[PDB]
A paper describes a structure:
[name] filaments are composed of six [name] isoforms, having three isoforms with three microtubule-binding repeats (3R [name]) and three isoforms with four microtubule-binding repeats (4R [name]). Western blot analysis of the sarkosyl-insoluble fractions from the gray matter of cases 1 and 2 using the anti-[name] antibody HT7 shows the presence of [name] bands with a migration pattern corresponding to 3+4R [name], with identical electrophoretic mobility in both cases. Immunogold transmission EM of dispersed preparations of [name] filaments shows phosphorylated twisted ribbon filaments that were decorated by the AT8 antibody. We determined the structure of [name] filaments at high resolution by cryo-EM imaging and 3D reconstruction. Visual inspection of cryo-EM micrographs shows the presence of paired helical filaments (PHFs) and straight filaments (SFs) in both cases, identical to those of PHFs and SFs from AD and related diseases. We determined the structure of PHFs to a resolution of 2.9 Å and the structure of SFs to a resolution of 2.9 Å. The structures show identical pairs of C-shaped protofilaments and the symmetric inter-protofilament packing between PHFs and asymmetric packing for SFs. We showed that there is no variation in the structure of [name] filaments between individuals with DS and sAD (and FAD), and [name] in other brain amyloidosis, further supporting the notion of a common mechanism through which different amyloids trigger aggregation of [name], resulting in [name] filaments with identical structure at their core.
Numbering used by the authors:
A (entry chain H), B (entry chain J), C (entry chain F), D (entry chain D), E (entry chain B), F (entry chain I), ...: 306 to 378
Write the structure that this text describes.
């Protein structure tokens, strides 16, 4: 068996921006209550229990490229 | 058996912007109550239990390219 | 068996920005209460229990490239 | 069996920015209460229990490249 | 069996910035209370229990490159 | 002229209570914005401009008696 | 002219209470913004401009009696 | 002219209480911003400009009696 | 002219309390910003400009009696 | 003219308390910023400009009596 894998990639993900400007993120805080008894978990688990988060994310370009290659014989 | 895999890609994902400008994110906070007894979970699990989140996301281009290649013999 | 793997990649992820500018992140704090009894967990687990986080993220370009290559014989 | 692995990569992740500017992160503090009884955990576990964190992250470019190569015979 | 692994990489992750500027991080302190009884953990565990942290991170470029190569015969 | 003023008062304002009990006042905070230019005021003026107040008032009897007597000749 | 003023008062304002009990006042903080230019005021003026106040008032009886007597000849 | 002023007062303002109990006042802090240019005031003026106050007032009886007598000839 | 002023007062303001108990005042701190240019004031003026105060007041009876007598001929 | 002023007062302001108990005052500190240019004031003026005060006041009875007598001929 002969396998040739050559996925040539010539590419760009780009952006141009003059300015981003005035960004105002001003939340009132609220209130979060979470009640549970038993938390049992495993094997690739991501969790958030009870939160009040504020995220301001202002990159000067946040261009993203995700690529995967899988060859299984 | 002979397999030739050559998916050539010449491409672009792009943007241009003069300015983003005045962005105002101003939430009142509310109230979140969550009640449970037993949380049992596993094997690739993502969860959020009880939240009050505020996200302001203003990238100067957030162009995205996702690509996957799978060859199974 | 003969396998040739040569995924040539010529690429760019880029951005240009004049200025980012005035960014104001001013949250009121709220209140978070979390109650549980037993936390039992294992094997690749990420968790946040009870939080009030504030993140301001302003990179002068936060361009990202993620790439994976897997060859299983 | 003959395997040749030569994933040549010619690439760039870049950014240019005139200035970042005036960034103001001014949170009110809130209040976080977390109650539990038994914490039992193991094998690649990351956790945050009870927090009030404030992060200001302003890199002059925070361009990121992540790449992995895996060959399993 | 013959295996040749030569993933040649010619690349750059870069940034240019005129100035970063005026960055003001001024949080009010809040209050964090965490109550538990038994903490039992092992085998690659990272944890934070009860915190009020403030991080100001302003690198003059915080460009990052992460790369891994794994060959298993 | 003869004026006799003798408004005799025999009275009670009273209360009895076993217990008041469990009182929970838990507001989410909201947001108040007030804009004006010129505030000009005088002669017995009470005012509140822009507020977010929370009052919990639980007296163990808050019985009130208000009485006024005015004789003008 | 003869004026006789004898407003005899025999009275009580009272209360009895076994217990007041569990009182929980737990507000999330919000956000208040007030903008003005000129504040000009006089002659018995009470004012609050811009506030976020939290008052918990739990007297073990807060019985009140207010009485005024005015004789003008 | 003959004026006789004898407002006899026999009275009580009272309270009895077994216990006051568990009082919890736990506010999240918010944020208050006040902007003005000129403050000009006089003649019996009380004011609060810009505040975030928290008052817990728990007297073991806060019974109050206010009385005024005015005779103007 | 003959004026007789004899406002006899036989009275009590009282309270009894077994115990006051567990009082917890635990605020998160917030943030207060006040901006002005000229403060001009006089003649019986009380003011607070910019504050974040926390008062816990727990008297074992805070009974109050205020009385005024004014005779103007 | 004959004026007789004899406002006889037989009275008490009192309290009894078994115990006051466990009082916990635990504030997070916040942040106060006050900006002005010219402060000009006179003639019976009380002021606080910019403060973060914490007062715990727990008298074993703080009963108060205020009385004034004014005779103007």
């Amino acid at each position: 068996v002969q396998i040739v894998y050559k996925p040539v990639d010539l590419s760009k993900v780009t952006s141009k921006c003059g300015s981003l400007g005035n960004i105002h993120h001003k939340p009132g805080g609220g209130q979060v209550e979470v009640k549970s008894e038993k938390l049992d978990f495993k094997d690739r688990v991501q969790s958030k229990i009870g939160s009040l988060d504020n995220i301001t994310h202002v990159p000067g370009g946040g261009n993203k490229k995700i690529e995967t290659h899988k060859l299984t014989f």
